[PDB]
Amino acid sequence: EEAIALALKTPRIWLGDYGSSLRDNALMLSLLEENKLLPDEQYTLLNTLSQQAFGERWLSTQESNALFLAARTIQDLPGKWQAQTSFSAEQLTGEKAQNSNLNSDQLVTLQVSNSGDQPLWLRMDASGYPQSAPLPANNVLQIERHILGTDGKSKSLDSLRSGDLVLVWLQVKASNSVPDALVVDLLPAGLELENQNLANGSASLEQSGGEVQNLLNQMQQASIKHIEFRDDRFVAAVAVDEYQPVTLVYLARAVTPGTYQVPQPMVESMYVPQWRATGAAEDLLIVRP
Amino acid sequence: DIKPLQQAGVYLAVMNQAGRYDYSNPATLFTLSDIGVSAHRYHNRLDIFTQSLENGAAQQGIEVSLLNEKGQTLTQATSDAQGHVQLENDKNAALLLARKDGQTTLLDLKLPALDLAEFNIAGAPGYSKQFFMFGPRDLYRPGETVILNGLLRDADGKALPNQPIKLDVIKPDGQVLRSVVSQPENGLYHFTWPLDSNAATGMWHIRANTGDNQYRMWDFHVEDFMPERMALNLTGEKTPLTPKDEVKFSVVGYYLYGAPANGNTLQGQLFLRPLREAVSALPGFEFGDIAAENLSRTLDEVQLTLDDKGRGEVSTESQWKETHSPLQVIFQGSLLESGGRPVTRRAEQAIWPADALPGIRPQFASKSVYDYRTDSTVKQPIVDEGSNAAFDIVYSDAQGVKKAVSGLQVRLIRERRDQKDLIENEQTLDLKADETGKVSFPVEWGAYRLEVKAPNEAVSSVRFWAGYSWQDNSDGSGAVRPDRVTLKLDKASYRPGDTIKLHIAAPTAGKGYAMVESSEGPLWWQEIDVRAQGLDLTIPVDKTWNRHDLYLSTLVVRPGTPKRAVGVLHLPLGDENRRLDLALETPAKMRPNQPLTVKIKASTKNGEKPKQVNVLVSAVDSGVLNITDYVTPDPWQAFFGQKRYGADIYDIYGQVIEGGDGDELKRGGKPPVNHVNIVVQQALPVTLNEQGEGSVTLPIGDFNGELRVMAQAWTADDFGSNESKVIVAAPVIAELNMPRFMASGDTSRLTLDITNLTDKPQKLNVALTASGLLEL
Amino acid sequence: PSVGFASRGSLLPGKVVEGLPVMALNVNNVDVNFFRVKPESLPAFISQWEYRNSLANWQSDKLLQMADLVYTGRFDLNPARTREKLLLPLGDIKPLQQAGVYLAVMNQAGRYDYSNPATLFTLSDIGVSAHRYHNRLDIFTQSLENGAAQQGIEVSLLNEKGQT
Amino acid sequence: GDSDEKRRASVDIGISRLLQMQRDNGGFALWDKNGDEEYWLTAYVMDFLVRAGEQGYSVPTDAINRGNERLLRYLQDPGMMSIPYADNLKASKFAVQSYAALVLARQQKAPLGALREIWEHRADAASGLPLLQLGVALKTMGDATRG
Ligand SMILES: [Cl-]
Ligand SMILES: [Cl-]
Ligand SMILES: [Cl-]
Fold it and tell me: Minimal Cα–Cα distance from B14 to chain C, Å?
């Protein structure tokens, strides 16, 4: 019992054991299951495995073998589930995963109970603006922002004038595969996006970005699910990994003169919200008339 | 003298030097035959036309072996005058072969059909019952209600029984959002649904299913747009400039509420770019030196102020006076509001080094080949190493007509692999007017460039690689392009009671066929002769032809190899009496918060019987419609306008041997609300009385700008459409310019434009106060 | 579906010839090409050839650059479906009756493979037996079959460069 | 080695080849003038071409000036450098600037203001070489103390 307890606290030819963290976590899971011991530790390893498999580019034969053997018995159980919640007077039931949107009144008093004869699996994702601006932080993912002029030089963020076109350059890195990274770049109120989807009514990225052709070529190589040119933000859904950093470039215009706070660039995984990065805090943005 | 080769079947010749042993030996696939087939593919059937090479058109055709993907024959028979054949077409059909013992001709459906890019064979694919999908706009903001209307008619715009149409709302990701069963109300389909505020941005669409399981699409943008408050016109010169000429753009700006952009700033960019696709009439033909340097540049940054009339001029002196290649100057102009928000437009000015230029089109495919010098995969025209490279060369003006020239320096250049560009081969070409020059050069390996120089010093060149192809081919990039037969018609439009007189002006003499086609097959199956320089022939337009996908086609061949030429032309059957003369009477100018009255008057000459005319009136802000240069939906052009050519032509004359939802927005943070006003109105469909008169009253709110009045009219076969512009403006306009949003702790200089649109001087006091999360 | 040289020897006798031995299975027609190795720089050919069983298509360019083609002869055989070995009538080939070392490269009529069977040979009923010493070399000329034709003037002693 | 004649002929061939890899901005690409810019290798090839001139080889004046203009952009603007495969981006940027600095200083073309500003980020260095190069540059251009 001393060795087992010590094992679940010990982190991970070279070693010669053909191993990895992913493989070893799945083998440890099967060992605990097989010997019907520490069921709470089994659930912890199962969640850890789900994130590691998700973030792994390719699996070795021994990794997929171990992962298959650790998870072959979970889908053999029915999808039926029952719960009594704080936000419902009536009991919640289903045969598959059913999502339920919640507001702040519901979330602060959120309580869920298992009213079934089998275990239920819950996932709770809450989001909103903090009371104050947090400091730049990063876990798995990395993000950096830089603003260039259409001349390919770094733009002096003070000498910005109403009407100027700027190229906003984002670079996203990751220590493992993030197949579902969401890049949210909230704009300073003085910058407006040149909507590329409405080509007739805006300045062209292709035409105004000739001096950053390397960045456009890097961006063309990225696996991009979609790009959104919204009122207050630039959004990109992308896949990223350690051997392939992602370059994104968008065209913006300095519009309303004023002094603007600059939100930090953000990137996070939809499936693993703990894979998150906030870029360096920038100086105030001044748009001159 | 080879007796086994005189037998039927496809052969392969593998040659080698007597006692030589190499990795690869020259090999070719061939068939010995003087038979020349020319098939026509349709949605259900396939009509093949057997012929013969040299002097003779031996049309008899029983010998048609149509093989599938497995390699088994499906059908074989004979028909028509001198010979022809009609067969059942398959979706996964692969081959076509000719004769049992009297030689063999190979034609495969796997190869791309003849490229008719030089012919006007474009239009709607709705050959079946027509469903016209229309609305007041094609641009919506998330959280808006999408308005869509519909009218169902047959192939000839005639009414049919009340049937349900199933409509699906498709997201940019391709997933369906909602599915409905639309039922008509007084012959009109009307679909309305609200976009969520968390809706994805991009190209959404509504797909309709009439029952044919062939979806009809209605595209609409869902974007965070701002309606334009200004109109910007940037005009160059229609005719290209010479390399010595100064480039000039005339600028016109005005507020849509009816006032010039007096003193407004215009910021912009001037760019120099090559004009390789210099002739739109010749798609695929490239013009200019690809080896020429400094053709892509940023000329200047434009900064000017419009005069009191809202006028300006943009100019730049020429810095390409010695160019031998066509160029273009692009002006990307941004007309700014007093707050800074622009209205951006682009204008292009063509520059031609001469009045007529040489153009090159490779006859070989363009495949995606990786280049490690640029570390990026780029699609470039490639040909097999040790094979000849074919090219189409033309000496054309801006309009597309080929001019006569003599002394073209056709040069095959071998580009340095790892000294200087090695000139491999040289030629001298003479061109006739309306003639397409065809040059073939023996190519070795590596990078190559084919350049043609005209006596006026104008140089045009195309780069091409010689090597291997690891699949990854562009969808029919190496399709055969036939020589053009300019077909002329006597009348602009025809009808069941008329008689067509077509003039077949082929480049030379040649036997073949002349016919009228549809997507279901031909209607004038045979006509065979062509003699001298032109042929005027009679075509009686039949009364049962109730469709607008009807086209005309000709084929001619002449031996020296028998050069083949094709002619294609749309047959117009859209009658003008089926169009409703819809008149709209609206005031030119009006005040905000007052109702707008639209006076409708439907009529037609000689008839003048507008029996139960239905009118759907709508009014949309011009600043919305100008973003996507929205065209007023026309029901006449929808149901009677030129439809696409329903046939595919295959021939072997090109191969003849010669010797959750909202989850992403939740992660980013609740977006701030945008309170912009989208002025859109759609009144219910009204009925016009005995005289063909009616009135619609649309309530207009607190709007200052221009409003486009749009109307759609219908009966059973009569369709009409009209538009009028209504300026909605107050005596004194007071408009506030603000950013799209503001963040906490930001400072913004808002701008309030107070404009006196009266003939009298005004004295006003402006009292300002701030509430909510704003302070002055 | 194969055919190759069975003996893989350097010398076939002029007497009791029976050509070159070839073992075949289901192969009716065989196209054989003969090449006479250039007398000059012959030791450089032997070192490059190393008395192989087959000839590689890429390495053939360097090796057959010092050998000239004399005959392109196809041979008629009659097997339908046993892997019996058979003769090759060479007596009717007049250019092969001339002096020099030959190389036979055989292949199935319309077959294209990475390597084709090849052998280095000499048609002669002469049997020499040399004796090497610290300073001199005594050679003993003879003859195959019944007879010991000892006369020997014909002794071409070539060095590394390929000169007598 | 080579004969003196062969060796000199080969240097001349190499110069003419390297000049064809010079981009329109004066920077150098790996194979073609249209390829992406190589920041450290631009300083490397500029070092080679300037030294080649001191050793009796001809390099066109326009190419050296364009190259030097680009090296000056490296001292002034490290922020526009895209090195996405770099583990220590600041260390990479610092090695580029220090090399650029030495090549310009050996021609008396490195601005002391830029050198002093690169020197403020000395902590970014992952090797002694960029610091020794920057040091020689500062001494040559006039700041013997920081040098
Ligand atoms: Cl197990
Ligand atoms: Cl998820
Ligand atoms: Cl402004």
Answer: 9
